[PDB]
Design a protein around this nucleic acid. Structure first.
Ligand SMILES: [Zn+2]
Lengths: 162, 195, 165, 36, 48, 138, 69, 56, 31, 54
RNA sequence: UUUCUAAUUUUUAUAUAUUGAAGUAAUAUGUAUUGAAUUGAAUAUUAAAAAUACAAAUUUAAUUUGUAAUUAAUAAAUCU
């Protein structure tokens, strides 16, 4: 069938076979507008105001850039990863040289609107400003392929971020 | 009761105060889905309506983080858990819903040729979700305050749910005074499109 | 990898609500042999005067009469097919129910109303959730066999334990 | 194909359309009669 | 017990103000750090 | 680019010109009272040689058989002939000077029918007394 | 926050004498009144880790004279 | 058919002690006088080095 | 005259005059 | 002079870095670091036409 | 598309500036502390101490000097 016996929601694994489930292309389509806002608990978080498909390598290159522009001892970046992953070039004639093994391996997320990505969470009484915050994320936002805006602590008040 | 035929939803007295649509709040009786409710009676957020709980129940305060707050359900609270439910039923209905359209769009700018009216959102609220409101509360975005909605694809616009202060309703909904109704304008030829 | 056959159409061969002869297949159900294994549960279980064919799970009525689907009050996914034998009993009411509601004199809280059944049961039996949710102790489910010989209980039924309402 | 924009006069004479329909359905919600 | 839509519901056609370049400081505060809209490629929204 | 061709009473219009406020004022008139003198003034409107019945009863047809009040020739309107607007062809011209009344079985329907009137541009009606107009037999 | 430990103690009785040789207007020895001058040297101390006793601690300087009351 | 509709008001429409914080960093228009601020010309503030050093 | 008119009440129906403003061949088979 | 792709990216790096209307294009011109910190908004060439650059 | 005629859908639709705000003054916990060859608001990290307002810079091997001192500048008023 289709999703069950998940591997902790990263990707679904076939019930009668440990193979990955190999879903449809437009499964889990991000082209909703997510109704549920995110209750971020970091001081600032980077939510995705639009939708798209973002790799893990695009999200890891962004962390390596956010982790440069951030004061070390004070704030510890927090990157969320519980979201579900999705496959790539999977099909057989649709792969190159019958190497379906080396094309599906990439795992990209289908982010809807308003999913938090990172967190400049605090480890002290040190504080942040939106100017002090957007300045950090302005490095990584140039890698995350979709549009994203930073949001302050607590419930994103999506009346304003949009 | 049978393993085949199970109640699709069951009655529930909430002890805690869950945010989600299936959620409730302190002490109201709600028929929430079975699978969800069954991981509440284990979780402790809910308890099946025994005759005892129908008078009082020890609800929860995040202040001391334990089931101390006794919320007695006299006929007065049962006039409070109604207006507070009837309110956040309009909330969780428009916020969960994704109201569709079919419109005509000759031209290139992907522009709906007869753009939308705040009449034409309360009309697709009452049509699809039966949510009956005043179209004087629907505030549009800044891009569509001038020309109406006017563009295909996903538009959203804010619906103002005014009367939520004597219900003591905050932190159990995303925004006390608004809600994002989420349009979508699926262009269609004269066959299925109106206006 | 392989091929596949086309999924046949397993749908109604009458109009629900309208009269019905016995030689009509009321519904040709998927004997949902998941893939030709031997265990399935049909969508529309048989009802009054309707008898299910064992092999292909197709419901054939047993007596000519008007037909209807009774969605279970507990779970609206599990339906029966009722055939009530008297065709005049419903026609001579429909012709009224649809003549009254034309003059605006019929009430919409009728049991047969589709959207009211959720509330209808609750006006009469207010705790029916608890009457089906109640779990029975294995003592009362097998009432004292001596009460059967002493004749107190008319006849012990130990397997009929599930409330199908 | 839909290449150049709908001329403005057309959009305007199509805003008269929805304001025709918005004037039909004002007729199709009148009472069936009038107590006179 | 009256709610007037008009108090809180404001539908104002606001002029999107230019980032004032004629003054130096108000050009720097106005620098809304979302000018990295350059990631607006209409990229593949359901594939990679 | 609407609101340039059409007014502001376009797109910013809550076309629900039916009942954003009147329903409230309906429950206002419900509160105060209606009594003998409040019918005795209407009695003078029956004393007025010009006979247009003042009060109207929106009650089920079996109810009125039980307590017939039709004596002063008052109007018996089904509460939908009021709501639907089928009654405007028999309704006073002076929308600002006329105050009819509305009798009803239980006072929820009365106010629920008088709000329909105030939706039809009517200004004064205190909207109920099932028992007074019988105690004021006239 | 750089070092993890309060360094050498002090007591307000001592800052009042560091504050006596530190007068901004050495023409007007007390332009800032002395008590106002101390909160300055106290803050500069705390900013160096100098936890003084009268504050920063649960108990003030214990005395063999009398009850805490 | 169910129709969902708001309850009748018993208290103030816009919440006051229930208001969610605004949601945008509340750097007021007066701490960084970015725009929308109007001041009398007699009462011009904060020119401590330009034209408040010689106040009138 | 400030009075709900009093008299034996006749009710009168309505008669719609319908015209066709859009071509029929653009629309569905039900319309 | 690196065309700062939108107008909004323009930033005055130096004290002598100011704005200028170089033929309808808002640009940044600095006497110091003359081309090192110079920025020019993206816009049509100063002398375009209606058939060549739309 | 019988023929003469009449007609309500038109290779005509509105494009972002006014203002290189650059004079107006010695100082004073203080060159904090730490890490540092050195660092004095502008190395590195560290940032909720204060009082008698000006610690996210340029500058210098360091400082001082020297730039800088949170302001009027309403395109909205459709143009037909
Ligand atoms: Zn420069």
């Amino acid at each position: 069938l289709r999703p069950s016996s998940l591997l902790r929601a990263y990707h679904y694994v076939h019930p009668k076979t440990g193979r990955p489930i190999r879903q449809y292309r437009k499964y889990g389509d991000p082209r909703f507008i997510n109704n549920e806002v995110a209750l971020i608990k970091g001081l600032f978080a980077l939510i995705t105001t639009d939708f798209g498909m973002v790799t893990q390598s695009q999200l890891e290159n962004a962390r390596l850039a956010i982790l440069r522009r951030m004061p070390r001892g004070s704030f510890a970046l927090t990157m969320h990863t519980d979201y579900e992953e999705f496959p790539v070039v999977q099909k057989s004639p649709e792969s190159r040289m019958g190497a379906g093994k080396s094309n599906i391996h990439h795992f990209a997320y289908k982010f809807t609107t308003g999913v938090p990505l990172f967190e400049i969470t605090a480890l002290s009484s040190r504080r942040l400003n939106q100017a002090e915050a957007e300045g950090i994320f302005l490095a990584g936002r140039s890698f995350i392929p979709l549009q994203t805006a930073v949001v302050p602590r607590g419930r994103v008040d999506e009346y304003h971020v949009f | 009761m049978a393993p085949e035929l199970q109640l699709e939803y069951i009655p529930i007295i909430f002890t805690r105060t869950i945010l989600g649509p299936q959620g409730g709040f302190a002490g109201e009786e709600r028929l929430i889905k079975r699978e969800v409710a069954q991981k509440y009676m284990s979780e402790g957020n809910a308890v099946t309506p025994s005759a005892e709980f129908h008078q009082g129940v020890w609800c929860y305060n995040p202040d001391s983080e334990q089931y101390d707050r006794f919320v007695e359900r006299n006929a007065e609270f049962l006039d409070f858990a109604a207006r507070k439910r009837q309110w956040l039923d309009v909330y969780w209905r428009v916020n969960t819903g994704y109201l569709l359209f079919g419109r005509q769009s000759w031209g290139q700018g992907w522009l709906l040729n007869c753009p939308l009216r705040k009449k034409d959102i309360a009309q697709k609220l009452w049509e699809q979700y039966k949510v009956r409101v005043d179209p004087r509360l629907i505030e549009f975005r800044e891009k569509d305050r001038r020309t109406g909605i006017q563009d295909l694809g996903h538009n959203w616009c804010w619906l103002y749910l005014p009367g939520a202060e004597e219900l003591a309703i905050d932190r159990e909904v995303y925004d006390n005074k608004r809600v994002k109704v989420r349009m979508h304008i699926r262009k269609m030829s004269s066959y299925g499109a109106l206006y | 990898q392989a091929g596949s056959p086309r999924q046949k159409a397993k749908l109604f061969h009458v109009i629900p609500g309208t009269p019905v002869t016995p030689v009509e297949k009321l519904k040709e159900q998927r004997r949902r042999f998941g893939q030709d294994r031997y265990s399935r549960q049909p969508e529309y279980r048989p009802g009054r005067n309707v008898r299910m064919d064992p092999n292909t799970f197709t419901l054939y009525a047993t007596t000519k009469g008007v037909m209807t689907i009774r969605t279970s009050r507990i779970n609206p996914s599990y339906k029966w097919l009722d055939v009530e034998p008297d065709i005049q009993k419903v026609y001579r009411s429909r012709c009224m129910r649809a003549a009254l509601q034309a003059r605006g004199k019929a009430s919409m809280m009728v049991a047969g109303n589709v959207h009211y059944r959720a509330e209808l049961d609750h006006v009469t039996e207010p705790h029916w959730r608890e009457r089906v949710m109640r779990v029975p102790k294995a003592t009362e489910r097998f009432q004292d066999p001596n009460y059967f010989t002493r004749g107190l209980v008319p006849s012990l039924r130990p397997l009929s334990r599930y409330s199908y309402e | 194909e839909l290449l150049h924009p709908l001329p403005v006069w057309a959009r305007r004479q199509q805003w008269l359309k929805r304001d025709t329909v918005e004037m039909n359905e004002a007729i199709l919600r009148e009472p069936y009669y009038r107590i006179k | 017990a009256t709610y007037d839509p008009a108090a809180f519901v404001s539908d104002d056609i606001k002029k999107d103000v230019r980032r004032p370049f004629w003054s130096r400081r108000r050009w720097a505060l106005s620098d809304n750090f979302m000018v990295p809209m350059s990631p607006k490629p209409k990229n593949t929204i359901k594939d990679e | 680019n609407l609101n340039k061709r059409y007014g502001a009473p376009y797109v910013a219009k809550g076309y629900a010109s039916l009942d954003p406020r009147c329903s409230l004022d309906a429950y206002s008139s419900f509160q105060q009272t209606v009594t003998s003198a409040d019918m005795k003034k209407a009695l003078l409107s029956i004393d007025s040689t010009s006979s247009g019945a003042l009060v109207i009863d929106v009650r089920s047809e079996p109810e009125r058989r039980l307590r017939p009040l039709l004596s002063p020739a008052i109007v018996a309107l089904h509460p939908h002939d009021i709501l639907s607007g089928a009654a405007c062809p028999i309704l006073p011209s002076n929308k600002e000077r006329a105050e009819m009344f509305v009798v009803a079985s239980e006072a929820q329907r009365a106010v629920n029918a008088c709000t329909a009137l105030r939706r039809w541009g009517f200004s004064r009606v205190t909207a109920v007394s099932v028992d007074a107009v019988s105690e004021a037999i006239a | 926050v750089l070092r993890g430990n309060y360094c050498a103690y002090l007591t307000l009785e001592m800052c009042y004498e560091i504050a006596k040789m530190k007068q901004m207007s050495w023409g007007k020895v007390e332009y800032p009144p002395i008590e106002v001058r101390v909160r300055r040297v106290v803050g500069q101390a705390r900013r160096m880790g100098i936890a003084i006793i009268g504050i920063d601690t649960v108990h003030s300087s214990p005395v063999k004279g009398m009850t805490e009351k | 058919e169910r129709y969902y509709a708001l309850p009748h008001l018993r208290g103030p429409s816009m919440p006051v002690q229930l208001a969610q914080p605004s949601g945008k960093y509340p750097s007021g228009k007066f701490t960084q006088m970015m725009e929308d601020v109007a001041i009398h010309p007699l009462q011009k503030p904060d020119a401590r080095y330009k034209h408040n050093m010689y106040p009138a | 005259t400030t009075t709900i008119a009093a008299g034996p009440y006749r009710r009168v129906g309505n008669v719609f005059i319908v015209t066709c403003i859009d071509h029929p061949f653009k629309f569905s088979w039900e319309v | 002079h690196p065309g700062l792709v939108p107008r909004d990216k323009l930033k005055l790096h130096c004290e002598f870095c100011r704005f200028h209307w170089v033929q309808d294009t808002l640009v940044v011109r600095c006497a110091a670091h003359p081309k090192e910190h110079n920025q020019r908004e993206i816009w049509l060439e100063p002398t375009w036409t209606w058939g060549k650059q739309q």
